[PDB]
Amino acid sequence: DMTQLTGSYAASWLPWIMIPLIFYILPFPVFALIFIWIEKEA
Amino acid sequence: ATKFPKFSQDLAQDPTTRRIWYAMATAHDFELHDGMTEENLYQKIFASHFGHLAIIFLWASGVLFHVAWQGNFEQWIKDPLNVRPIAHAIWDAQFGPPAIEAFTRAGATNPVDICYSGVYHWWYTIGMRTNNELYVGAIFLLLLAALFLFAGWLHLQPRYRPTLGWFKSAEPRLNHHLAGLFGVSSLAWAAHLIHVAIPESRGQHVGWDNFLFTPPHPAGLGAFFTGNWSAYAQNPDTAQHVFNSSQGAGTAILTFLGGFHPQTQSLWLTDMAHHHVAIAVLFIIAGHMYRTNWGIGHSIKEMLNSKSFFGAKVEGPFNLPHQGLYDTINNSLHFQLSFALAALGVASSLTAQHMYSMPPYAFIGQDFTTQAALYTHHQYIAGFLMVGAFSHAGIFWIRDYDPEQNKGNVLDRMLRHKEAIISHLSWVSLFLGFHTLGLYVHNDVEVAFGAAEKQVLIEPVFAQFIQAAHGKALYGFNTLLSNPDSIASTAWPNHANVWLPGWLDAVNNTTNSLFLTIGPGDFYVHHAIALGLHVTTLVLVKGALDARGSKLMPDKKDFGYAFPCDGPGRGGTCDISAWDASYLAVFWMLNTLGWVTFYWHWKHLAIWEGNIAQFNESSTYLMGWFRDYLWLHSAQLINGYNPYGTNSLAIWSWMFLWGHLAWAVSFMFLITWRGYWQELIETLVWAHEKTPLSFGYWRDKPVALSIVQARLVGLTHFTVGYIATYGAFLIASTAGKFG
Amino acid sequence: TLEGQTPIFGGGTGGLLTKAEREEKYVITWTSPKEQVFEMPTGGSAIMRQGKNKLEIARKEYGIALGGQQLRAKFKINDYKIYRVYPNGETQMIHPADGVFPEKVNQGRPKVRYVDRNIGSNPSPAKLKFSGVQPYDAP
Amino acid sequence: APFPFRTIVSLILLAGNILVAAIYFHIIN
Amino acid sequence: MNISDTQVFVALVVALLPGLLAFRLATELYK
Amino acid sequence: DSDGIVTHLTGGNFATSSITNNGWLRDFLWAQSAQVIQSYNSSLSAYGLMFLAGHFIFGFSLMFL
Amino acid sequence: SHTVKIYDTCIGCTQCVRACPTDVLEMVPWDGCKAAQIASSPRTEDCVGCKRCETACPTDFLSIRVYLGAETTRSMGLAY
Amino acid sequence: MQHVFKYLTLAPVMATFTMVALSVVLIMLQIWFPGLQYGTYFKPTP
Amino acid sequence: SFAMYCHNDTMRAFGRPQDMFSDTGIQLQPIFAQWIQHIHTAAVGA
Amino acid sequence: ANSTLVPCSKSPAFQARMKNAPDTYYFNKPFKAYAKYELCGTDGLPHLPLDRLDRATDVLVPIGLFLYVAGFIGWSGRSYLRATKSASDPEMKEIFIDLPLALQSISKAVLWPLLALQEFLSGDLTARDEEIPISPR
Ligand code: F6C
Ligand code: CLA
Ligand code: CLA
Ligand code: CLA
Ligand code: CLA
Ligand code: CLA
Ligand code: CLA
Ligand SMILES: CC1=C(/C=C/C(C)=C/C=C/C(C)=C\C=C\C=C(C)\C=C\C=C(C)\C=C\C2=C(C)CCCC2(C)C)C(C)(C)CCC1
Ligand code: SF4
């Protein structure tokens, strides 16, 4: 059916989790890591 | 101070947000890093180049993996002319059902993107047939990237860090990169074509499991050592050969047929194999020219410093003093990068100009969207490389050029008559601009007043004569290759013109892009391109030659490549740095490549749509370009989504507006300048300090972007919007109208 | 401590900020022959007192602009001084540095950052590569 | 100065342009 | 016939090797 | 018409098309420029010429800015 | 901080000192010119880089030069 | 009146007179000989 | 004002007209301006 | 010989344009001139080729006519400028045109191709390189 995102390729559950992980789950912690790195006192 | 950036204490002590911005912009300018020595500079660059190569290999691995995983390569093989190649799957969780249905196409049951990079045609031609083969290649490139990543780390360890003398040894590097990097690699590719690609195009499978005991030719290697090289050219592929099948298939591995394979309408695989064999021999020979360790060979320093021509006294090569140049190039990484970028820019343009007219991949000439994307891609990259070559030329003048070691040589002479060079470049730009625009608007007025017969329509006779000289008999000229009785066509002494019969068939074919017919409309756009080339060169050359100083700023070299200005004194000095000339030249480079890609796209759109007369009659006046190219072909693009529904062009519709938005944003960074925003920020600083419940507070004081930074940011938005807008239009107006 | 009474001012948004309490602050003091209206460095009008005055300012440029373009040029007041006040209370007088205005030559002032050549004789940056020396700082 | 080296190369390059124009104008074949 | 589940998982595991080596090179260059 | 039924110049596009700037780009700029863009060889050709003239001056101003 | 240098072509016209908005420059005794004085920059830490001194310099080329360098709170002209 | 004559020699005034005169000459050339084209100048009317 | 137009463009491209700011989706009725029209029309008796 | 270009009078596409043209001053005579003298492409519009030994006067006459007029304007401006260099206030003679000086410059510029030739032969056309303001290298 064409009412939902699906995948006929192998392991179609991978984009189901990788897309949230890379685009709106991990990026904020990554920004936090970079912020700490660039604000560290000498 | 902060630990970041590690390479600059001046930035690390900056208490404002400018510290973060400038750290990113100067991170890869290794020469300006604190405590940087020449030996450490080369070692860091060497390791960085290993990282870039690994990124390239990972990028190629990703393209292969996603096609093997989510593409339709095997289905596309069975019908390349009617199956849309799939780039990768789409997972956007905020799609609606109409969007999911629209993007579910090309035989897939899930939303997908249609590949336009031509990798399907390329892999098909070189003998790849199954998704497993693509997967193995992807895994191999993952390991290859790991090998180069380890090499970069290894050559940073103390025992493996090369010395400065190793980096400065020019002659051995040229020998190895010519004979080995260029020659042996070409020979190895010709081996792949002969052993794998050619057999696979004839229906027989050759892989790692059986290539050791499956000879590519019945005569074997005995014919090569005996000298019976003609056996490899016997029995070529027949004119009724079917690609990827044994029907009509020959046995020759190195033919020289020329022209195109009749079915695939692309270059013969056996011709491409013999091409890389000959190229390999030429480059391997070229790799033995310079002396490294055995006395024999030329010394580049001796050649440049030579002042005697077989006894006679000369200033140098062509009686021109080239002395002292060897140390100038060898000690200047910016001089070397200038030639490297210029060569890649020319090669990228040649790739674009020769690939659409001479498609090397099976059926790629019939994928109209792929052809348009590939030409535009490599031409725009060529423009950027051309800008970079002159940008680092200006950096060379300031950082690496010293007049003492170059006194009296050919490089010094160029600087001594820079006014004549710049003024004459200005004259050519003015002449081309005045007359090309003047003739365009003259045709505009006449066509507008119902007097199209009164247009000035100059025939491109010089270029038409070249086409006739190459075998095009359409124009009626009877010279050289268009004259069968000419000594050029007969090659009277030897009659070894075995290239000609195949070449003439492709030249006079009416369904390909080999020497497309040209008229007055093509005449004016080439002169517009000449105007763009000369002005962009004028901006870049003027910036490079004035980088060290001018009458307005005699001591410019002491201020560096990139600085905002020299203040409002002496009349005002905005955009006076050599960096600003490269900044201004990107605008003209984008405009010039815009004219080039508009011309290529519209001409091929008329051909593909069967309306060649539309281009020939409307390209002679600018309203024809505006109405029949831009306005007419935007209809399908802007209807990707509308109040009545959506289709597969919705992405190109949204990206079309996204590019316009980025282009609009750049105008803000380019028109408004810093002091306006600094005063506004100060007001916001007051507001934050006086507002309760706002416990946050800046660790870096917020300041407006610097003068130079704003020019770069505005140029980035301008360029990104430029590319995104035309890219969406190019894909939508071609894919929407064709396959 | 610094003596003097502040000018009549009803308040404004161009005054001191966190930087005054955290990093540094400036004070300009002067004496006027009468009570009169002057323009504040950051907008608005203030009334300077009869005796000795004291004004707190965020930047040194405010004091130079007020003392130079207004106190001397307009009100003919030449005894103004500018101090730099640190958060810990340390105060140093910075203008005029030696009691004489900088535009008037004074004995005992050394030459600072003087280059003993014309500007056109600066060496090219190529000769100073990796040496850490700018062309204008070259001997 | 007559500029011998300058004028020899210039005339050779010009001769190439004239020779190409001869074929272009159907004067020679 | 595209690749299978095992091939995708194998590629993910293999990609860890350039991933770790990229981190080593990046930290080495930072020195 | 005689029955009092009104047919508007653009037929009520505003309610549904003006809520997106793709609708502004397509149904207002692209669609309503048909008269000026096709005015060549007619009495309105001066407007077509000045349409291009205004576009030229806008791009021309960009180098001063 | 910015770097301000004074070259020997100075004629001691005191114009650069008068134009400075932060009192970076002062006039010191000298013998290289008729005015018997030359510009000096003892307080470059207060220099904002406005280049008003260069605008006021009458010599050709300039006898006083400003080279923008590392940015500090007072060199950026920040009241906050 | 000598000041008026001097004003008439001003650069904007002289340029305006020159451009007006050249435009007049070109305009009458279009009226008398409309449709002149390269390959047609100085040829008799057929 | 403007980012809500961008919201509308993204919703329409997604094929989600029900999520748009429109008369048929999420309505934003200018009730105060509509009220003034009614008051001014009824003022004359229409 | 170019074959895709034929005389306009023999072009069927050009003839169709001739009949459909409006009957005004702007089309009656010009179409008659174009048919007799111009070469037309497949689109029926006149084209200007530079590959014909004949009709070379049709190329040289407009080129030479322009080059004479453009050189006349340039030589008038050059001679006038050099005449004002000897004045005490040359700038004021550029915003105030010296009519007796301008007429003298215009009269001599009629023979500018000859004047420029003796100017170049005597070495008075160009100034020496070392006597010209230049920027530092
Ligand atoms: C940090 C903290 C802080 C705080 C607190 O604490 C604050 C606050 C305020 C108040 C007071 C006010 C009001 C609010 C509003 O409405 O607006 C905003 C909004 C928002 C949303 C903002 C935001 C908020 C916060 C940030 C939140 C956060 C959270 C998140 C989620 C985190 C995340 C993390 C991750 C990792 C990513 C404001 C404002 C302003 N801002 Mg402002 N902030 C700040 C930050 C910032 C930054 C970074 C920047 C840059 C971008 C700026 C900017 C700005 C401007 C332009 C302006 C304006 O206009 C305004 C005003 O003034 O008026 C009057 N600002 N501020
Ligand atoms: C540079 C190569 C490259 C690129 C551009 C992409 C691009 C994409 N991949 Mg992908 N992928 C690649 C290689 C690549 N792939 C390789 C080699 C593997 C096998 C390990 C995978 C396995 C994979 C899976 C399993 C999935 C994707 C998916 C996707 C899509 C969403 C992004 C995502 O979730 O990433 C996920 C990426 C990974 C899990 C691993 C990526 C490993 C590569 C080699 C890292 C490359 C880093 C790069 C070179 C450094 C950039 C430097 C910086 C300066 C730019 C996107 C089209 C998703 C998809 O199909 O959505 C529809 C998804 O579910 N990828
Ligand atoms: C609210 C708006 C919105 C958002 C947030 C997204 C978000 C997403 N969409 Mg999407 N989409 C939208 C609206 C939106 N969409 C609309 C209106 C349409 C039309 C109906 C689509 C149609 C659409 C399609 C057809 C596809 C997506 C995809 C994606 C995903 C990939 C991220 C992306 O778009 O690029 C984000 C980009 C980056 C993070 C950049 C990566 C960093 C690299 C290194 C930058 C390098 C720059 C490059 C080298 C220079 C240019 C190169 C170029 C010339 C080739 C992501 C989940 C793709 C997907 O599913 O992928 C898995 C996909 O195939 N969308
Ligand atoms: C092999 C190619 C090559 C190499 C090795 C270099 C190397 C260098 N260039 Mg150079 N350059 C190149 C090509 C190249 N360039 C081309 C093609 C152009 C024309 C556009 C330029 C134009 C150029 C200018 C104008 C300047 C340099 C400078 C420099 C030096 C410092 C780099 C820097 O500023 O820090 C690193 C810089 C950045 C990381 C820039 C940020 C990224 C920009 C803004 C692009 C925007 C990102 C875009 C949205 C997405 C891109 C993909 C994403 C993954 C990043 C360094 C030696 C600078 C220099 O030497 O100063 C004296 C300098 O001023 N280059
Ligand atoms: C449509 C936009 C546009 C146009 C037409 C031009 C035109 C020009 N640019 Mg330019 N430029 C632009 C945008 C534009 N630029 C932008 C956006 C940038 C990025 C900032 C630049 C950056 C740039 C640089 C860096 C350089 C140029 C140069 C040039 C000139 C070289 C071309 C030439 O001589 O042709 C002939 C001249 C023209 C076509 C100009 C139009 C002439 C008009 C039509 C004559 C009409 C006369 C008429 C009587 C006037 C009416 C009366 C009126 C006064 C009221 C030319 C004046 C170069 C230059 O000066 O070379 C000499 C140069 O170095 N430009
Ligand atoms: C309607 C017809 C028309 C119009 C309006 C113009 C308009 C223009 N032409 Mg042009 N031209 C035309 C037809 C036309 N052309 C034709 C048919 C030809 C023959 C192919 C030329 C060849 C031509 C050249 C070669 C040049 C122009 C130039 C110019 C510009 C300045 C002309 C002038 O007198 O400046 C006032 C004059 C001066 C300030 C000094 C005199 C300059 C002349 C042109 C050169 C000296 C003449 C001498 C014989 C040396 C010739 C050098 C040559 C061999 C390279 C102006 C925009 C010039 C230009 O674009 O400059 C950037 C320029 O150099 N035109
Ligand atoms: C006095 C007449 C005169 C003469 C003989 C020249 C001669 C020259 N100019 Mg030049 N120029 C002039 C006026 C003149 N200029 C004026 C007034 C301007 C300002 C618009 C310019 C702007 C200019 C530029 C920007 C460039 C030249 C260039 C050149 C050189 C080759 C191209 C050319 O012929 O210019 C073509 C002509 C123009 C570009 C415009 C000039 C047209 C003006 C309007 C004519 C003025 C006539 C004058 C009022 C007559 C009054 C005389 C009267 C009192 C008796 C050549 C040395 C080029 C160069 O350096 O090449 C090496 C170049 O890049 N000129
Ligand atoms: C045949 C022909 C042709 C071609 C031609 C050619 C190719 C030419 C060349 C030419 C050249 C290659 C030239 C050169 C030159 C050089 C020089 C160096 C010059 C100089 C000049 C001068 C110096 C001038 C002066 C003057 C005068 C005289 C007048 C006015 C003023 C003045 C001052 C400007 C064509 C197709 C187009 C057309 C048809 C015919
Ligand atoms: S303005 Fe220039 S000449 Fe005058 S004192 Fe200052 S540096 Fe010397």
Q: Do B113 and B91 touch, CB atoms closer than 8 A?
A: no
In whole angstroms, give the CA distance from residue H37 to residue B455. 9
User: How many other β-carbons are positioned within 10 Å of the β-carbon of residue A35?
Assistant: 12
User: Counting ligands in written order, which one lies closest to the CA of residue B389?
Assistant: 4
Chain E CB within 8 Å of residue B54 CB: yes
The residue type at G34: K
In SS3 terms, chain G reads as: CCEEEEECCCCCCCHHHHHCCCCCCEEEECCCCCCCEEEECCCHHHCCCCCHHHHHCCCCCCCEEEECCCCCCCCCCCCC
Chain A CB within 8 Å of residue B104 CB: yes
* Beta-bridge partner residues of G37: G29
Chain I CB within 8 Å of residue F21 CB: yes
Which of J65, J66, J76, when mutated, tests ligand 6's pocket best, judged by the most ligand atoms within 8 Å of its CB? J66
* Beta-bridge partner residues of C28: C55, C82
Distance of alpha carbon B607 from its chain centroid, rounded? Answer: 25
- Which residues have any ligand 8 atom within 6 Å of their CB? J 50, 59, 71, 74-75, 78, 112, 116
CA of B532 to the centre of ligand 5 (A): 12
Closest listed residue to residue B201, CA positions, set B367, B360, B362, B364:
B362
- Would you tell me which residues 11-40 of chain I have a C-beta closer than 8 angstroms to some C-beta of chain B? 12-17
In whole angstroms, give the CA distance from residue B481 to residue C130. 59
* Beta-bridge partner residues of B89: B112
Distance of alpha carbon B374 from its chain centroid, rounded? Answer: 10
Annotated binding residue F63: yes
* Minimal Cβ distance to I9: which of F15, F16, F21: F21
Chain B CB within 8 Å of residue H7 CB: no
Residue I11: C-alpha distances to residues B112, C132, D26, F19, I4 (Å): 20, 57, 66, 11, 10
Q: Do J95 and J88 touch, CB atoms closer than 8 A?
A: no
Cβ contact I–A (≥3 pairs, < 8 Å): no
Look up residue B545 and give its two tokens. 């030659």
Q: How was this structure determined?
A: cryo-EM
- Data resolution in angstroms: 1.9
Residue A35: CA atoms inside 13 Å, Cβ hemisphere, count? 9
Q: Which residue has the tokens 């028109």?
A: B671
Chains meeting H at 3+ CB pairs closer than 8 A?
B, J
| Stretch (H or E) spanning B580 | helix B578-608
Integer-rounded Cα Rg, in Å, for chain G is 13
Distance of alpha carbon B48 from its chain centroid, rounded? Answer: 22
* Beta-bridge partner residues of B312: B309
In SS3 terms, B46-85 reads as: HHHHHHHHHHHHHHHHHHHHHHHHHCCHHHHHHCCCCCCC
Chain E CB within 8 Å of residue B131 CB: yes
Q: Is the CB of B434 under 6 A from ligand 5?
A: yes
> Collapsing DSSP states into helix, strand and coil, what is residue C29?
strand
Which residues in chain D are contacts of B465 at CB distance < 8 A? 24
A5: alpha, beta or left? (left if phi > 0; alpha if psi -120 to 50): beta
Q: Do B119 and B140 touch, CB atoms closer than 8 A?
A: no
Residue C126: C-alpha distances to residues B26, B418, C33 (Å): 20, 21, 60
- Which residues have any ligand 4 atom within 6 Å of their CB? B 25-29, 337, 341, 384-385, 387-388, 391, 395, 561-562, 579, 582, 712, 716, 720
Q: Do E24 and B93 touch, CB atoms closer than 8 A?
A: no
* Beta-bridge partner residues of G28: G38
Distance of alpha carbon J86 from its chain centroid, rounded? Answer: 32
Look up residue C9 and give its two tokens. 């001012």
The residue type at B93: A
- Which residues have any ligand 6 atom within 6 Å of their CB? B 427, 430-431, 434; J 62-63, 66-67, 70-71, 73-74
CA of B122 to the centre of ligand 3 (A): 26
Q: Is the CB of B684 under 6 A from ligand 1?
A: yes
Binding site members of I for chlorophyll a = 7, 16, 32-33, 37, 40
Using DSSP, how many helices (H) and how many strands (E) does chain B show? 30, 6
Integer-rounded Cα Rg, in Å, for chain I is 16
Integer-rounded Cα Rg, in Å, for chain J is 24
Q: For J111, which DSSP code?
A: G
Q: Do C89 and C24 touch, CB atoms closer than 8 A?
A: no
Residue B176: C-alpha distances to residues B57, B183, B275, B286 (Å): 22, 9, 21, 10
Q: Is the CB of B91 under 6 A from ligand 2?
A: yes
I15: alpha, beta or left? (left if phi > 0; alpha if psi -120 to 50): left
Q: Which residues contact B710 (CB under 8 A, 6 or more apart)?
A: B669, B670, B673, B674
* Beta-bridge partner residues of C81: C29
Residue G78: C-alpha distances to residues B18, B703, G48, G75 (Å): 13, 9, 10, 8
Which residues in chain H are contacts of J32 at CB distance < 8 A? 45-46
Q: Which residue has the tokens 């020219």?
A: B289
> Collapsing DSSP states into helix, strand and coil, what is residue J15?
helix
C85: alpha, beta or left? (left if phi > 0; alpha if psi -120 to 50): beta
In whole angstroms, give the CA distance from residue J69 to residue C91. 78
Closest listed residue to residue B385, CA positions, set B353, B350, B356, B348:
B348
Q: Do G80 and B685 touch (CB under 8 A)?
A: yes
CA of J102 to the centre of ligand 6 (A): 22
| Stretch (H or E) spanning J119 | helix J112-121
Q: Is the CB of B688 under 6 A from ligand 1?
A: yes
- Which residues have any ligand 3 atom within 6 Å of their CB? A 19, 23; B 90-92, 99, 103, 113, 650-651, 654, 723; I 10, 13-14
CA of B92 to the centre of ligand 3 (A): 8
Q: Which residue has the tokens 């796209």?
A: B601
Closest listed residue to residue B50, CA positions, set B157, B188, B168, B150:
B150
B703: alpha, beta or left? (left if phi > 0; alpha if psi -120 to 50): beta
